[PDB]
Each structure stands twice: as structure tokens, then as C-alpha cells.
Amino acid sequence: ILIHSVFSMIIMCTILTNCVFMTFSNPPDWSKNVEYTFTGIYTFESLVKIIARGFCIDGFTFLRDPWNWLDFSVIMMAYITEFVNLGNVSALRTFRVLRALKTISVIPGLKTIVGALIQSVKKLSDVMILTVFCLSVFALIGLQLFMGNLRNKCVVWPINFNESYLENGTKGFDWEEYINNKTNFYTVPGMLEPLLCGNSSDAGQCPEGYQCMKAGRNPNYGYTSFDTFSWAFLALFRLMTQDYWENLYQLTLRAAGKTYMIFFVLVIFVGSFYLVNLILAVVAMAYEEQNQATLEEAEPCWYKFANTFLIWECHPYWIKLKEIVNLIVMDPFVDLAITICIVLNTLFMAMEHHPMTPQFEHVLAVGNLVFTGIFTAEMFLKLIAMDPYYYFQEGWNIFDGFIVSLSLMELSLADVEGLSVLRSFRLLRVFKLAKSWPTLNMLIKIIGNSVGALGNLTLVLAIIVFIFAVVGMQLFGKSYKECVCKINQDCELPRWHMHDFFHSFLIVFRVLCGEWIETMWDCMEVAGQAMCLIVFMMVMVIGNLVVLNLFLALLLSSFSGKSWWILRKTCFLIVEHNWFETFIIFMILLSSGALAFEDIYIEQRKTIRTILEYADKVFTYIFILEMLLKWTAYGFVKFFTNAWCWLDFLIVAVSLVSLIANALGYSELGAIKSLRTLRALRPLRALSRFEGMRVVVNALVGAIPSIMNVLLVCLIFWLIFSIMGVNLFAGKYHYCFNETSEIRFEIEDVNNKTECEKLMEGNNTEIRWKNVKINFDNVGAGYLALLQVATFKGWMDIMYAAVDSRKPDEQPKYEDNIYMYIYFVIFIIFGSFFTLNLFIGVIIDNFNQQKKKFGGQDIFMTEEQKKYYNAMKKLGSKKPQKPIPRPLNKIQGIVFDFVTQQAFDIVIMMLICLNMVTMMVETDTQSKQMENILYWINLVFVIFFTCECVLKMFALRHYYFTIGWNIFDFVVVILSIVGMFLADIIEKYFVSPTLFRVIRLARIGRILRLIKGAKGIRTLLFALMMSLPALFNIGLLLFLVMFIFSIFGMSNFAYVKHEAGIDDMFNFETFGNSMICLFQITTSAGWDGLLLPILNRPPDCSLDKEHPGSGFKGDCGNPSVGIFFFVSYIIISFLIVVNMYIAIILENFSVA
Amino acid sequence: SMEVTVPATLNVLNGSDARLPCTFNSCYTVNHKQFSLNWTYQECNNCSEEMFLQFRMKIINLKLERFQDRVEFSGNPSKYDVSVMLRNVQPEDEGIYNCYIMNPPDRHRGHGKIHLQVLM
Amino acid sequence: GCVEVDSETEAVYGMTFKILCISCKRRSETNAETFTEWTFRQKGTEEFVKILRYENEVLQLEEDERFEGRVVWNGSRGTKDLQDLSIFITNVTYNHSGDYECHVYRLLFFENYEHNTSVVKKIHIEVVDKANRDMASIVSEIMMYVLIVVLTIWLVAEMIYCYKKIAAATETA
Ligand SMILES: *[C@@H]1O[C@H](CO)[C@@H](O[C@@H]2O[C@H](CO)[C@@H](O[C@@H]3O[C@H](CO)[C@@H](O)[C@H](O)[C@@H]3O)[C@H](O)[C@H]2NC(C)=O)[C@H](O)[C@H]1NC(C)=O
Ligand SMILES: *[C@@H]1O[C@H](CO)[C@@H](O[C@@H]2O[C@H](CO)[C@@H](O[C@@H]3O[C@H](CO)[C@@H](O)[C@H](O)[C@@H]3O)[C@H](O)[C@H]2NC(C)=O)[C@H](O)[C@H]1NC(C)=O
Ligand SMILES: *[C@@H]1O[C@H](CO)[C@@H](O[C@@H]2O[C@H](CO)[C@@H](O[C@@H]3O[C@H](CO)[C@@H](O)[C@H](O)[C@@H]3O)[C@H](O)[C@H]2NC(C)=O)[C@H](O)[C@H]1NC(C)=O
Ligand SMILES: *[C@@H]1O[C@H](CO)[C@@H](O[C@@H]2O[C@H](CO)[C@@H](O[C@@H]3O[C@H](CO)[C@@H](O)[C@H](O)[C@@H]3O)[C@H](O)[C@H]2NC(C)=O)[C@H](O)[C@H]1NC(C)=O
Ligand SMILES: *[C@@H]1O[C@H](CO)[C@@H](O[C@@H]2O[C@H](CO)[C@@H](O[C@@H]3O[C@H](CO)[C@@H](O)[C@H](O)[C@@H]3O)[C@H](O)[C@H]2NC(C)=O)[C@H](O)[C@H]1NC(C)=O
Ligand SMILES: *[C@@H]1O[C@H](CO)[C@@H](O)[C@H](O)[C@H]1NC(C)=O
Ligand SMILES: *[C@@H]1O[C@H](CO)[C@@H](O)[C@H](O)[C@H]1NC(C)=O
Ligand code: NA
Ligand code: NA
């Protein structure tokens, strides 16, 4: 009934035209008739569908199909909008996105994908419930700990009553206006938010003349706060997703002290790693089950032109030439020659710079010309040797034809303005090695499957990103232009806004990347809180779900005399002694810990430094003795064939060399001074000693050989992308600051480098022509910048300097070249998403094979840990516990009845829920009457719980000390009694508000009884407890790595300039601060800021700084060792945390 | 200009009360001191412009001969009301009312046009 | 910046000594205008007497012969933010004993808010003839030597006992 395919095609064309028109930001008035035409086409389709089985009550009508409901809804909304309507024009204009959403229904196959998403969501519900309750518990903990601490600001304390003017010129003093007047705060020069302070000894430090009072509005526009449960929940949801969580980490630790870092470690290793891994694993289970369910369910005219024109056989001399040149190809020596030429070409285009001598750029030009000439000759010889028809029949040869044609078009169009992206098309020649590499062919297979068997799913993802981007653009677009000065102090559009469509797509991409909070704050400040919260939660959930499903689908598609002898055995017996090994482990622990006390606070406690220095001698002596006696016990050949023995001997030898140099008076020499910092490597002997760390490192080293090839492929792919980035951005990363105003000059006063140097000669160093220090200026810097971009940290500065970049020697201007954003988008799509998919798939295959090697057993636990594993596996079954038979008393019988009905359990759970919501309602600056109401309601709750406990004790004390949950109830209720008693009698000699806060936290333990009545949450908690030992071993290895890198930070990156990310707090000057920084870097969060102040140069430093209290001089460290420190830690941390992810994910699969 | 909504056309009885509002929607709700607002009236379309009301840190009524003691302000700038009220309107009052405001925290300077006519 | 260390309490006759007084800002970010004065009194002597004053460009020393031509300044070099107060004594005599007090006067500059603060640190030194090596060094020497020798005897005794037991075991076969 007029359902011919041409109707579908014209509807498709119309819907794409409507999508483009929505993409347009400001619709010109001549497009109003085009929109009317679109509306007419839609209502014509509506007429067709209403004349073809239109009436609702009739079976198989279009009302039965849910998408036709949306069709009718959008038609009726268009009709309402085209005449008088409600005043909210923005909402009714946004309601047109159903037009674009219709693409889901009209395109075949998308309904199945949407359904699949529906089953995945329906499967992940239990983990959502557990996530919500865990986040609520942590929110209560954070609320009761950091209540109002985020407000702590340095208020000018010596209240100047003599000139304390009021708002209305009273000359009088009012308290509530002194505590909120914004210019009574510190606001450290450079930052925007006022500096956070604190009374605690290890908290932030107030300057001379300021207090540490809580005064005024919360930081980050007032959305980073623990004052109320709502913002605490927002902050901990942010911590779970780890979006810009380094800022919250720094703020809370600076306000409430460094000792609360335990809470952040607890939340990261519980709610951030484990909960996210749980979500991912359950979605993976759902998709795998559905995927195997699909597997179960599966159970003339132009030819005559081709024969004449596409065939070049016309003359026998030419035919003979064709045969001869086909012989000349020499296929056994053709592939090798072309691969050698390709490798030479790619490592020749690799060498690229901003500063190029004429000879070097001439060499590059000549080499590129020679290489393109060789490839053109190869193409021409192939065409003449074998017919063009069968040549183009192979897709590989048409790929080569595209490459060679694009190469040829370059020499003709060598004077085209701009178009630097055209010169990077030669990089695709590297892909020709995919015929030789099987793994590069696997990468191409993954890329094809992205747009092949899953082209419909990637189209669904594109449509989702499109509709979210247009919803944002039409909802908050005009708002971002009306409220410009509220978010940006310069009254200009911020870097990331929703005014244009491209910027809206960029922000939705960023939300997909993970950085949602920094824009969600801004759009709250602009256009209301509720709309932004709903829009951003929806876009994050939907986009992350679709991207994760696409990643999983790609992964699954890719997947499928006679004294020496006696003395020797005596030495072997003495080394084999377990007590002796415990002693040597204690000695190595002490020697490793002795390095902690070596920091900037070493001119103090001179007795400690002297004792540690002199105990270093005895430690080195006992380790030398251990090495000698192990030598004697085993034998030279026995000892030197063990890698751990080599490491131990190396450390002992370098320590002995250091002692010999010290005894020779060579301490002050530069060589021995540089060898001194190698003392940080001492804790490595714990690898040989500790069994868990040894097992884990053995597992990683065993997994490396299957992993080097994948890393080689990733390096080649990032090399292609880095050569593209160097071609696009070489030299376009230069500035002209005027440090007094520290403003990058706009390009209307100074444009070239020459004019900036004219300012240089006229002025002094007050104007500086300096680089970004993270740039595309060579392949090495390209790898560094791409690592920052792919880790999603530091990518903001690179992208800003790229989109502002216009010419190699021209001053950058604000977004003259915005469209290079798509370069970073493409890099994240290909080299950070697809390469990650390939890497993860290879890891999964390797780990499956490794597990199948050792009889399907775990590869991260020791033998005793394996016995513990099996014991808990056996004990995890159902135990027929004794039902506690009824006693021989009537009153005891009735009380036992009361305690045995489920109704008693239900009312207690409900009352616990009420107590939990009363914990929720607590807010800062709450009215004192509300505080009293909370006080008495808490007292009533505690008294009722005590009455219940003592009633059950009088019922059966001896056999209710038999259940662990009852013991938990006992401890929480008695500790609540202790807390209330101390609240009543705080008036003593041991007043401690912090311990008071902790004992009030102890109340929160009672709501954990809710998991008793739950089964899936109980099973998941049992899974976490069951997989704990592998987490413990990997955590010890990670902690030891943190220890070594922390000592390295002490030795090298102390005394660096405090510029960005290294402050008076969170620096490398002390052991606590050093592991603060190291743990911040462990999750890769904000490692850009930590790395940045090292990369500066004595133009940005002073090579001779006074540094009072120390003979050490210099203000910043060596850039070369700074990069090696942070890049190597990220790689090492990344490899380790994956094992944590594997240990959690793969263990869960074995459970179900 | 800026977002201003005004009555497109209003008719006033002979000598009756007249109320012509000038609402305005933007960020940064109006404060008292730093905010600057203006009110000008024109006796015809192409005549001269004579400002009659201003508020520079305080309400300033210029007290023109056309508006000696008739124009009064009883609105609410916080509630987006800078309205001017004209009691006992005269036929010579037929003309244009214009409301000029400027918000210090923002940077949007805009105006608003109002047309008033008197029936015989 | 904030590495505050007290000065050594012993000076040897005839040699040089570095009187040390480190008072750091609570926040290194702040810029301050600092100047100092040093007060001194000998053993069995009356109230302190000022000796040297350093105000942001130069050091003025009092005309008392107890310090003329033998006091040089080892603080921060011409930076107007002292942050490091160190008087150096050349050719230490017996008169340079008793109590020293370093007074630090700061004028911290902020956006629109100056602040004047005074910090006083008291340091007591004695002048001797022989550099009495501190008890820490000698106790560390003794402890290291005794620990080394006890470890040697422990290992030797363990080796001897194991050797005797294994000899008694292997003589059976
Ligand atoms: C927060 O506190 C600061 C400092 O007390 C306030 O700034 C000061 O405000 C007073 C009156 O509001 C100003 O006094 C005025 O001085 C002018 C001369 O410039 C004089 O003609 C006036 O009669 C009046 O006395 C004072 O200059 C000003 N100082 C600074 C450094 O800004 C500020 O107003 C307070 N914030 C709020 C919201 O009240
Ligand atoms: C600015 O506002 C404040 C409060 O909003 C005004 O303070 C008020 O000043 C008047 C005039 O002195 C006070 O009235 C008198 O107070 C004395 C106090 O002993 C009392 O004995 C008199 O019987 C009389 O009530 C008034 O109490 C005081 N507070 C309030 C809440 O009104 C201030 O005058 C204002 N300044 C300007 C310049 O507008
Ligand atoms: C940091 O420590 C201080 C004291 O150790 C904490 O209490 C604060 O103490 C000062 C007095 O030394 C209070 O100032 C006074 O407050 C009253 C309140 O009405 C006011 O009327 C007076 O004019 C005077 O300003 C200060 O209020 C008080 N802090 C609070 C929040 O009341 C301080 O709270 C500690 N900072 C923290 C815990 O963040
Ligand atoms: C970099 O930006 C800073 C922004 O402060 C520029 O410094 C400013 O330079 C102007 C030059 O006319 C100074 O004006 C002078 O002020 C003094 C004192 O009021 C007056 O006696 C002079 O007659 C003249 O008007 C201005 O004070 C100064 N600002 C500061 C805070 O010192 C600097 O020139 C810029 N450099 C370059 C290379 O663009
Ligand atoms: C960056 O460098 C280029 C060339 O190296 C500069 O172009 C040159 O700019 C100067 C002045 O900006 C021009 O001199 C003036 O040209 C106008 C005609 O446009 C003439 O009427 C004047 O009498 C004067 O001669 C010069 O002609 C121009 N070069 C060429 C080949 O046209 C450019 O200005 C530099 N960017 C800066 C300084 O920001
Ligand atoms: C305020 O000024 C008066 C001058 O009349 C003075 O006596 C008083 O000590 C000053 N108080 C303060 C806190 O500065
Ligand atoms: C700071 O206080 C000292 C202590 O008396 C005084 O000598 C000096 O003049 C004061 N300086 C300023 C600028 O207030
Ligand atoms: Na971050
Ligand atoms: Na960031």
C-alpha cells in the first residue's frame, strides 16, 4: 500500500536534510518554507500510515508500534508550535529532535540494537542498586567528616573595627557581612577561587595575618561541597568516574589535612575501581550471553566495454613487453623490496622538525620525491604487466591507486595555500605492511568490523551523539550567549560552550571521553541546575553504554680434605632457614625505610641523619655478608643463573662502590653524587623476598612476550598519527607573553616572530617568546603529546594551542583554526580506542591461554593463597544452620516468636532506612532547632536499637553470640553508646572534635545491615572478598613501585618551582607529600600538572636559588629525567592496574 | 538589543490611569547601586527626544514640563519592572516610550520601544 | 623555603662560625619586606645589646669592638625578602659567648592589606678550644661496631654449630 522502497529512500533523504537543518544554529528566514515542506512530507507519511490500518482498536494497527507514537507526537507538536503555544520557546524547539530520532526507526536493523541495549540495562540493575547504596554510605561518611570544611578560607583575622564600613555606609560592624565580603579572602595570585586553609597541623597553611575560618561560598561555583547530601553524592559520583577528581582530592586534603587521604584511597579502591569493574563485567556478561544466543539462533553491456578498453593487449610488441615486465616484477624479491622501501620511507618522513637547515629540508624533499617516484614506477609496471581490469579487481590495488594518485596530485599542487592535511596522506603507505604483519591485519579487521558487521551499531552511536549534541545546542545555546560573564570573567565565550553545533558536539564527545564535570558546572551556572543535571546524566549514561557496547562487540568480533662440601651444605642449611629469611626481610624493610627520612627536612634531626648514615654501613655489611654466604652455599654457576640473584648482586655491588667512594673522599664528585640517587633501587630485594610480589612480577614478565608485538603495532600506529601531528603542527606552538599582565598577545599588535623580537630588542625579558613545552615539534614530542591526549590529561592545553595555531612563525589567535579539533577526535577514535581494543583483546586471549596452561587456576596467588581460595570456595555454599529451637517457657516462647517473624525484620530494616534518611537530612548551617530535632531523633533511634539488642540477649545470649551479623549489630550498638556517652561528657581533659566526628561516623555502620536481606549484593560482596588476595598481592607490588618512584621524587624533583600541580602542598619535598603525588598519578589523574614544572628551563627558573636552610641550589630539575620519571610510572602503573582489573573481571566471570 | 517584552498596543481612556511596563529577561538579577537604567519619551515619531526618568545609583526623575508631577515609578527592577505610570493622560502625550537599561555584571546593553496613543 | 634549623651551640676558638636563624613565611607565595636586628649579651652580663642591622640593601654593625672587622653577613643576597638570617663570625674569640636573639620584622604585601609581624628566635652558643665531637657521632660509632661484631659472632657460632651437627650426622654413614 504505497510502501515501495523509493518512499523509504525519499523519507531518508528528507530526514537527513532535516538533521542538517537542525545542525544549523540560526535558521535563516528563507528556510522557513523548507521546514514547512519537511512538515508537509512528514504529514503526508502520516496520511499514508493513517489510511493504511490507522484505527487504534483494530489489531496490528500502527498504535501497536511504539515508534508511530513518536511520529504522531512530533506531528502534533509541530502543529502546536506553528501556532500559539506555551511561552517556553526553547523546550518546544528542542522537542523537534524526535524528527532526527525517527532515523532509528526508519533505518533497518537499529531496533534490534536498541533492544540489545535494553537487555544490557535490564541485566545491570543489581550492580546499579549496589552502586547507589555504596555511594550513599560513602556520601554519609564524607558528609559527616568533611562537613563544611570546603568553605575553609583565609579570612583577614585582625578585624579592623576602626574602618569596618557597612554596605550602606554605617561605619558599624556586622559579622555576617564581614564573613561573606569577597575581598577579605586570600585568592593566591594566579588562581581564581580563594585559597583554602585549615587549622590542622598538616592541613593548608594560612599566611601571616589570616585565620582558617569557614567564610562564604563553596569552591567551583558552589557545586564542590560536602555540606549537604546532594553535593556529597555529586562529589562521590565524580570520584567514582574520576572526572577531574584531582581537584577535589587537593581541595579536601588542603582543607581537612593530609591524614584524610586514607578516605580517598578507600573510595578509589572500593567505589572507583571495584564498582566500575563490576558494571563493566556485568555488561560484558549480558552482551556475551546475547551474542551466543544469536549464535544459537543462527542454527553484459559494460563487459564488452571492459574487454576492449580495460585490456591493453592490442599489438604483439606491447604484449611481449607486458610479459617481460611481468617477469621483471620478481614476486619473491618484490614484496621484500617494497617493504624495505616502505620502512625506509616511513622512517625518512619520521625525521621532521620546526627548525630545519636548508640542507636537511632539501634532503627530505628529495627523499620523498624519490620514494613517490619508486611507488609510481611500481604502480605503472604492475598496470603494464597485468591487465588494469584484474588489477582494480583487487581492493588492495585500488587502495594503492588512491595512495599513488594522491601522491602525484601533490607535486602539481605544490603551491596551494594551507592544506597541510593533504601531505599526511602518504602515511597510509605504512599500512601496506599489513599484508606481512598478521597483527596489523587484525587491526585493519577491527577497523573494518567497526563499519562492517557493526556499521549499524556505530550508526546508532553517531545518531545518539548527534541528537544529544543538537539537544544541548538548542537548549543551552542562547543561554551560553546571554550569561557569558557569569562563567567567563572576561565576558567572552569560554573554550567549551554549546553556542555552535561543532562546540556542542565537542562537549558531548568530552562527556564521552570522561570530562563532564568541568562543563556541567558551567552550564549549571548559566542555565539552571536541574536541566543540566538531567541532560548530562542522560548523555553520560547513554553515550557510555553505547560506546562500551561498541567496544565489546568489536572485541568479540576480533576474538572470534672433604671440607668444601660440608661447609657448602652448612651454608645451604643456614640460608634455607625460614626464621633467617624472616630476619633478612626485616633487615631489608628497615634498610628501605631508612630512605624515607632523607628529604628537605634533613638539616633538622641531625641525630636521625647521623644514625641512619652510620646504620647504612652495617646494613651494607650484612647484605655483603649475605651475598658472600649465598655464593658459598649455592655456587658461582648456581647463583649467576638466577635473575633475582643478579639483581641482589648488582644492588650490593653498587652500594659497596658508593661506600668505597665515600671512604676515598669522592662524595662531592658529580659521578658519585649521581650514583647516589640509585640508592632508591634498594627495595627491589623485596621482589626476591616477598612471595606475592614475585608471583605477580613473574606473571607480568611471562605475559610480556605475547605483548611486545602488540606494543610494536601501537607504536607504529601512534607513529603514523605523530607524523601527521608534526606535519600539521610543527612550530605553531609559540607565544609572546608579557609576564606583568601574563596575557598571550592577540594577533593584531604582534603577528610574526620578527615583530616579537622587535619587542625583545626594544623591551627586556618582560616580554617572552616561549613554547608550550608539550608540542608537536618532532616524533618524540609527538609521542609525548599523543600520550597526554590519549590518557585524557594535559590534552586541554595541547588542543588549545593547536586550534589557536595558524602558521609556523605567526602568533596564534583565538580559534582561527578550530577544525583541527577533528584531528584529536580522530586520534582518540583510532589510536586510543581501536588500539586499546586490540591490546585488551590480545591480553584476554593471552590470559585465557595462560589460565588453561595451569589447569584453569589463578595466576596471581601463592600456594597458601590458593588454599585460602579453595577453602572459601568450599565455605561459600549453603550451610544448614540450626534454627535455634523454641525454649521451654511461655514468655520466652512469645519473645522468640516476636524475634522470629519476618515482620520484625521488615520493621527493623524500615527503621534503619528512616535513620539513614535522617543522617541524609543533615546539612551545614542547619537551623539549631533542626539540630536539636536530629539530636533527639538520633537518641530515640539509639535507645530503640539498644532495647532490641538487650531483648534478644535476654531471649538467647549464648546462641546469639553465634552469628557474625549479630556480632556486627553488637559492636555497632555498643560503639554508638560510646559515641553518645562521649558526646554527653566531652567536657573533660581529652576534648577531641576529630575523634568525635569519627565516633559519629561509627553510627553509619548500622545501615550496612541492609545487605543481609539482599542476595545479589551479598553475592557480589562475597566475590570481592573471594578475589581479595590477588588484589592484595598486586597492591603490594604497586605500593613498592610507588615507594621507589617516591624516593626518586625526593632525590630529583625536590626544590622545583611551585607552578601548576606542585604547590606548597602535594609536592615532592616530603615522604607523605611524595606518595600523595604518586597516588594521584597512579590513576593517571593530573600527571600533566605534576610533569609540567619539571619541563621548564632557566629562562623560566633561576639556576642559582638561595633555598634557605640548605646548601642545595637551583630552582627546577632536569627535563630529560622528568619525562622518563612520569612516562615510565604511567606505563608501569597502567600495566599493574590492568592486572587488578583482570583479577576482578575474570574472577567474576568464573562465579557466574 | 536585549530581551525586552512590552505591550504592543494599549488604549487609554480620557484622563484615566495608564501603566506601560518594560520587563527584561537576562542573567544577573537587578541590583540597586551599580545598575544603570534610563527612560526617554518622544512627543512624536520624528520629534526631539526628551529624557524624563533615570536611575544612576538612585531614582532620578528629571521632572520635565510634559511630566511635571504625573510620571511615577512603583514597579520592581528585581522583578523585571522599570515601568512608568502616567495618570491623567493628555492628547499631547501620544508618542514613543523607550526604556534603556544596562547590567554591570553582564555586558548586554539594549533598549525597548513602547507606543502609546490617546483616544478622544 | 621552609627549612628552619637552629644553629650549632659550639664554636672553636680562632676559627670561623656561622650563626644561623631561619624564619620562613607560612606561604612562600607571599612577597614581604623584611629587615632584622641582632641582640647579644655575654656570659654573666646584663640585658641584650644590638650588634648588627640588615635592612634590605646593606648591613650596619654597631661600633662595639667586640664584633668590628670580624662579622660578615651570610643571609639572602640582595633580594629584599630576607627569609634567611645568617651572621658569619670570623676569628671567633671567647667574648662571642652567651645569648643571641635574631629579631625578624616583616611587612607582608597583599592586594590591599599590609601586615607587620615580629618573630624572635633565641640561640645560645659557647666558645671552646677543642671541637667536642657530639655524643651522636660517638654513640653511632660504638653501636655500629658492636652490632657488626655481634653479627659476626652470631654467624660464626651458627656455622660452627651446624658444622658440628652435620659432621655428627655424616659420621654415622
Ligand atoms: C569589603 O570590604 C572592603 C574593604 O573594607 C570594601 O571596600 C571599601 O568600601 C568602602 C565603602 O564601601 C570604601 O569607602 C569609600 O571610599 C570613598 C573614597 O574612595 C569615599 O568617597 C566613600 O565615602 C567611602 O568612604 C573604600 O574605599 C573601599 N575600599 C576598597 C579597598 O575597596 C568593600 O566595599 C566591601 N564589600 C562590600 C560588598 O561591602
Ligand atoms: C544601615 O542599615 C542599618 C541597619 O539596617 C542601620 O542601623 C540602624 O541605625 C539606626 C540609627 O541609629 C538605629 O536606630 C537607633 O538605634 C539606637 C541604638 O541604641 C536606638 O537607641 C534608637 O532608639 C534607634 O532605634 C537602628 O537601631 C539601627 N539598626 C536597625 C536594624 O535599624 C543604619 O542606620 C543604616 N545606615 C544608613 C546610612 O542608612
Ligand atoms: C580555626 O580555629 C578557630 C579558633 O581556634 C575556630 O574558631 C573561631 O574562633 C574565633 C575567635 O578566635 C571566632 O571569631 C569570633 O566569632 C564570633 C562569632 O559570632 C564573632 O562574633 C566575633 O566577632 C569573632 O569574629 C570565630 O567565629 C571562630 N570560628 C567559627 C566558625 O565560629 C575556627 O572555627 C577554626 N576554623 C575552622 C574550624 O574552620
Ligand atoms: C605588560 O603589561 C603591563 C600591565 O601592567 C604593562 O605595565 C604598565 O605599563 C604602563 C606603561 O604606560 C604603566 O603606566 C605608567 O604608570 C606609571 C605609574 O602609574 C605612570 O607614572 C606612567 O606615566 C605610566 O602611566 C603601568 O603603570 C604599568 N602597569 C604596572 C602594573 O606596572 C607593561 O607595559 C606591559 N608590557 C609590554 C611590553 O607590553
Ligand atoms: C609579517 O611579515 C610580513 C612580511 O615579512 C609583513 O608584511 C609587510 O607588512 C608591512 C607593514 O605591516 C608592509 O609595509 C606597508 O605596506 C603597505 C601596503 O600594505 C604600504 O602602504 C606601507 O607604506 C608599508 O610599506 C609590507 O608591505 C608588508 N609586506 C609585503 C610584502 O606586502 C607583515 O606586516 C608582518 N606582520 C606584522 C608586522 O605584524
Ligand atoms: C581605633 O582608633 C582609636 C583612635 O581614636 C584608637 O584609640 C584605638 O586603639 C583603635 N583601635 C584599633 C583596634 O585599631
Ligand atoms: C613594624 O613593626 C616594628 C616593630 O616596632 C616597627 O619598628 C616598624 O616601624 C613597623 N613597620 C611598619 C611598616 O609598620
Ligand atoms: Na583529571
Ligand atoms: Na584536565
Author numbering:
A (entry chain B): 128 to 426, 721 to 981, 1181 to 1772
B (entry chain C): 29 to 148
C (entry chain D): 20 to 192
What did the study's authors say about this model?
After processing, the final reconstruction map from the best class of ~41 k particles was refined to an overall resolution of 3.4 Å. Superposition of the Domain I ECLs of NaV1.6EM and NaV1.7 shows that the ECLI of NaV1.6EM lacks the short α2 helix, but instead forms an extended hairpin-like turn. Importantly, the ECLI of NaV1.6EM exhibits more N-linked glycosylation modification sites than NaV1.7; N308-linked glycosylation site appears to be unique for NaV1.6 based on the sequence alignment. Consistently, the signature fast inactivation gate, Ile-Phe-Met motif (IFM-motif), binds tightly to its receptor site adjacent to the intracellular activation gate, resulting in a non-conductive activation gate constricted by A411, L977, I1464, and I1765 from the four S6 helices, respectively. The van der Waals diameter of the activation gate is less than 6 Å, suggesting that the gate is functionally closed. Interestingly, two strong blobs of EM densities were observed in the SF of NaV1.6EM, which are deduced as potential Na+ binding sites because Na+ ions are the only major cations in the solutions throughout the purification processes. The upper site (namely Na1) closely engages E936 of the DEKA-locus and an additional acidic residue E939. The second blob of density is located inside the SF, namely the Na2 site, which is about ~5.3 Å away from the Na1 site. Thus, we hypothesize that the Na2 may represent the second step for sodium conductance, that is, after captured and partially dehydrated in Na1 site, at least partially-dehydrated Na+ can fit into the Na2 site which is going to enter the narrowest asymmetric constriction site of the SF.
